[PDB]
Design a protein around this motif. Structure first.
Motif, PDB file in Angstrom:
ATOM      1  N   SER A  63       0.826  -1.218   0.000  1.00  0.00           N
ATOM      2  CA  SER A  63       0.000   0.000   0.000  1.00  0.00           C
ATOM      3  C   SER A  63       0.858   1.265   0.000  1.00  0.00           C
ATOM      4  N   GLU A  64       1.942   1.253   0.794  1.00  0.00           N
ATOM      5  CA  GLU A  64       2.807   2.362   0.885  1.00  0.00           C
ATOM      6  C   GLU A  64       3.436   2.705  -0.465  1.00  0.00           C
ATOM      7  N   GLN A  65       3.840   1.652  -1.217  1.00  0.00           N
ATOM      8  CA  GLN A  65       4.421   1.880  -2.530  1.00  0.00           C
ATOM      9  C   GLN A  65       3.458   2.587  -3.467  1.00  0.00           C
ATOM     10  N   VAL A  66       2.244   2.036  -3.557  1.00  0.00           N
ATOM     11  CA  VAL A  66       1.227   2.642  -4.462  1.00  0.00           C
ATOM     12  C   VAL A  66       0.842   4.044  -4.029  1.00  0.00           C
ATOM     13  N   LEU A  67       0.780   4.250  -2.707  1.00  0.00           N
ATOM     14  CA  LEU A  67       0.517   5.595  -2.201  1.00  0.00           C
ATOM     15  C   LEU A  67       1.450   6.626  -2.721  1.00  0.00           C
ATOM     16  N   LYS A  68       2.721   6.242  -2.883  1.00  0.00           N
ATOM     17  CA  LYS A  68       3.713   7.171  -3.415  1.00  0.00           C
ATOM     18  C   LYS A  68       3.474   7.446  -4.882  1.00  0.00           C
ATOM     19  N   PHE A  69       3.010   6.474  -5.660  1.00  0.00           N
ATOM     20  CA  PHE A  69       2.663   6.798  -7.016  1.00  0.00           C
ATOM     21  C   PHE A  69       1.572   7.900  -7.078  1.00  0.00           C
ATOM     22  N   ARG A  70       0.626   7.821  -6.133  1.00  0.00           N
ATOM     23  CA  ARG A  70      -0.510   8.733  -6.158  1.00  0.00           C
ATOM     24  C   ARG A  70      -0.159  10.125  -5.633  1.00  0.00           C
ATOM     25  N   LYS A  71       1.076  10.366  -5.237  1.00  0.00           N
ATOM     26  CA  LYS A  71       1.536  11.699  -4.865  1.00  0.00           C
ATOM     27  C   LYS A  71       2.102  12.435  -6.054  1.00  0.00           C
ATOM     28  N   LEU A  72       2.352  11.753  -7.177  1.00  0.00           N
ATOM     29  CA  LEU A  72       2.770  12.436  -8.378  1.00  0.00           C
ATOM     30  C   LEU A  72       1.698  13.424  -8.864  1.00  0.00           C
ATOM     31  N   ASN A  73       2.131  14.324  -9.739  1.00  0.00           N
ATOM     32  CA  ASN A  73       1.235  15.349 -10.315  1.00  0.00           C
ATOM     33  C   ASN A  73       1.188  15.242 -11.821  1.00  0.00           C
ATOM     34  N   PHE A  74      -0.032  15.442 -12.361  1.00  0.00           N
ATOM     35  CA  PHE A  74      -0.185  15.642 -13.795  1.00  0.00           C
ATOM     36  C   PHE A  74       0.308  16.964 -14.250  1.00  0.00           C
ATOM     37  N   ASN A  75       0.117  17.989 -13.412  1.00  0.00           N
ATOM     38  CA  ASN A  75       0.486  19.374 -13.711  1.00  0.00           C
ATOM     39  C   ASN A  75       1.974  19.589 -13.666  1.00  0.00           C
ATOM     40  N   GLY A  76       2.369  20.728 -14.298  1.00  0.00           N
ATOM     41  CA  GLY A  76       3.704  21.242 -14.171  1.00  0.00           C
ATOM     42  C   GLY A  76       3.921  22.010 -12.865  1.00  0.00           C
ATOM     43  N   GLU A  77       5.197  22.227 -12.574  1.00  0.00           N
ATOM     44  CA  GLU A  77       5.627  23.018 -11.435  1.00  0.00           C
ATOM     45  C   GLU A  77       4.889  24.375 -11.420  1.00  0.00           C
ATOM     46  N   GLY A  78       4.478  24.719 -10.189  1.00  0.00           N
ATOM     47  CA  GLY A  78       3.793  25.968  -9.928  1.00  0.00           C
ATOM     48  C   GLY A  78       2.524  26.174 -10.713  1.00  0.00           C
ATOM     49  N   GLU A  79       1.823  25.046 -10.931  1.00  0.00           N
ATOM     50  CA  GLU A  79       0.484  25.035 -11.455  1.00  0.00           C
ATOM     51  C   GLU A  79      -0.421  24.414 -10.369  1.00  0.00           C
ATOM     52  N   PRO A  80      -1.734  24.571 -10.457  1.00  0.00           N
ATOM     53  CA  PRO A  80      -2.659  23.965  -9.566  1.00  0.00           C
ATOM     54  C   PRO A  80      -2.379  22.470  -9.509  1.00  0.00           C
ATOM     55  N   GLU A  81      -2.335  21.945  -8.287  1.00  0.00           N
ATOM     56  CA  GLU A  81      -1.972  20.538  -8.127  1.00  0.00           C
ATOM     57  C   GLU A  81      -3.159  19.615  -8.518  1.00  0.00           C
ATOM     58  N   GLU A  82      -2.875  18.656  -9.359  1.00  0.00           N
ATOM     59  CA  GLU A  82      -3.817  17.647  -9.755  1.00  0.00           C
ATOM     60  C   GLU A  82      -3.073  16.331  -9.681  1.00  0.00           C
ATOM     61  N   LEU A  83      -3.464  15.545  -8.722  1.00  0.00           N
ATOM     62  CA  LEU A  83      -2.760  14.317  -8.450  1.00  0.00           C
ATOM     63  C   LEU A  83      -2.824  13.406  -9.681  1.00  0.00           C
ATOM     64  N   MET A  84      -1.732  12.748  -9.972  1.00  0.00           N
ATOM     65  CA  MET A  84      -1.626  11.770 -11.047  1.00  0.00           C
ATOM     66  C   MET A  84      -2.159  10.470 -10.513  1.00  0.00           C
ATOM     67  N   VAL A  85      -3.469  10.271 -10.765  1.00  0.00           N
ATOM     68  CA  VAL A  85      -4.198   9.067 -10.412  1.00  0.00           C
ATOM     69  C   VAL A  85      -5.214   8.787 -11.521  1.00  0.00           C
ATOM     70  N   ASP A  86      -5.590   7.499 -11.620  1.00  0.00           N
ATOM     71  CA  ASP A  86      -6.605   7.102 -12.613  1.00  0.00           C
ATOM     72  C   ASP A  86      -6.142   7.429 -14.017  1.00  0.00           C
ATOM     73  N   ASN A  87      -4.872   7.120 -14.297  1.00  0.00           N
ATOM     74  CA  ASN A  87      -4.269   7.313 -15.631  1.00  0.00           C
ATOM     75  C   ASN A  87      -4.349   6.042 -16.469  1.00  0.00           C
ATOM     76  N   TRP A  88      -5.537   5.441 -16.490  1.00  0.00           N
ATOM     77  CA  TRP A  88      -5.830   4.210 -17.192  1.00  0.00           C
ATOM     78  C   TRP A  88      -6.966   4.420 -18.186  1.00  0.00           C
ATOM     79  N   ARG A  89      -6.850   3.775 -19.335  1.00  0.00           N
ATOM     80  CA  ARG A  89      -7.906   3.703 -20.331  1.00  0.00           C
ATOM     81  C   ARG A  89      -8.760   2.495 -20.022  1.00  0.00           C
ATOM     82  N   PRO A  90     -10.088   2.616 -20.063  1.00  0.00           N
ATOM     83  CA  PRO A  90     -10.945   1.422 -19.818  1.00  0.00           C
ATOM     84  C   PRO A  90     -10.878   0.441 -20.996  1.00  0.00           C
ATOM     85  N   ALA A  91     -11.352  -0.756 -20.723  1.00  0.00           N
ATOM     86  CA  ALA A  91     -11.402  -1.835 -21.699  1.00  0.00           C
ATOM     87  C   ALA A  91     -12.198  -1.422 -22.913  1.00  0.00           C
TER      88      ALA A  91
END
Ligand SMILES: [Zn+2]
Length: 257
Positions: A216-244
């Motif tokens: 769980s701890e490992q995956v939690l760290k993935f979810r701290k990444l950001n889609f946005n660039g530096e000094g932009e509104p923070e949007e967590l990098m999560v749910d970066n999957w295409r459905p079937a």
């Protein structure tokens, strides 16, 4: 431009990339009861002892661990493949919660994440030429479930702080991707596509049956990444999957009984 929001996510991609509604799109649901065993399939040959990792990059959609692909140093062969495919990068897709995140599904089960090891067919000379060919890429897909930690993943986890936002990179040498593989190389295979724009129909998919366990701890760290660039509104990098996507006129083959 394209992403994984409400206004720019998978359901919108067809407007800029009409191949999104094509005949060989990925990912797909793997129906384990209708995938037929093909005794003619070979064992996979994963030869990663000489792999040379170079860098890790947050591209705004995921992070990629990049390899030196200027010679046959980490190659995939065998399995369903003819010829030799060179490792160029790996990356993951993951969820906001442990109950989703994988791209492929197995009997409609979603895993917490999915690892993609991307390789290109050396007969086409470079990646960019390979992606124009129906047999240009081979992607090894590995499911991640949450349980025990994966020791071989921790080096990746611990560098993620340094590449928090889009466009950041870091040196990432001497990383051994063998430490991300499960015990068994039993697989399913089918013809498909890239799962992100431009969605090109150039991939032989090789999806391993056995998931790896991460904590769980490992995956939690993935979810701290950001889609946005530096000094932009923070949007967590999560749910970066295409459905079937629809299987259409394809068969999924199993290497195992
Ligand atoms: Zn991917």
């Amino acid at each position: 431009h394209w992403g994984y929001g409400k206004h720019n996510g998978p359901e919108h991609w067809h407007k800029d990339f009409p191949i999104a509604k094509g005949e060989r799109q990925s990912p797909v649901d793997i129906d384990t009861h209708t995938a037929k065993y093909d005794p003619s399939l070979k064992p996979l040959s994963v030869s990663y002892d000489q792999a040379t990792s170079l860098r890790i990059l947050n591209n705004g959609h995921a992070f990629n661990v990049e390899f030196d692909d200027s010679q046959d140093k980490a190659v995939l062969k065998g399995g369903p493949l003819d010829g030799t495919y060179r490792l160029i990068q790996f990356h993951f897709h993951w969820g906001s919660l442990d109950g989703q995140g994988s791209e492929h599904t197995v009997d409609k089960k979603k895993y917490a994440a999915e690892l993609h090891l991307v390789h290109w067919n050396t007969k086409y000379g470079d990646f960019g030429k390979a992606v124009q060919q129906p047999d240009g890429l081979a992607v090894l897909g590995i499911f991640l479930k949450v349980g025990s930690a994966k020791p071989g993943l921790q080096k990746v986890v611990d560098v993620l702080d340094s590449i928090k936002t889009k466009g950041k990179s870091a040196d990432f040498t001497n990383f051994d991707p063998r430490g991300l593989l499960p015990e068994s190389l039993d697989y399913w295979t089918y013809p498909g596509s890239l799962t992100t724009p431009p969605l090109l129909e150039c991939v032989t998919w090789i999806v391993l049956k056995e998931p790896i366990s991460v904590s769980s701890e490992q995956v939690l760290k993935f979810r701290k990444l950001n889609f946005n660039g530096e000094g932009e509104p923070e949007e967590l990098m999560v749910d970066n999957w295409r459905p079937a996507q629809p299987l259409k006129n394809r068969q999924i083959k199993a290497s195992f009984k």
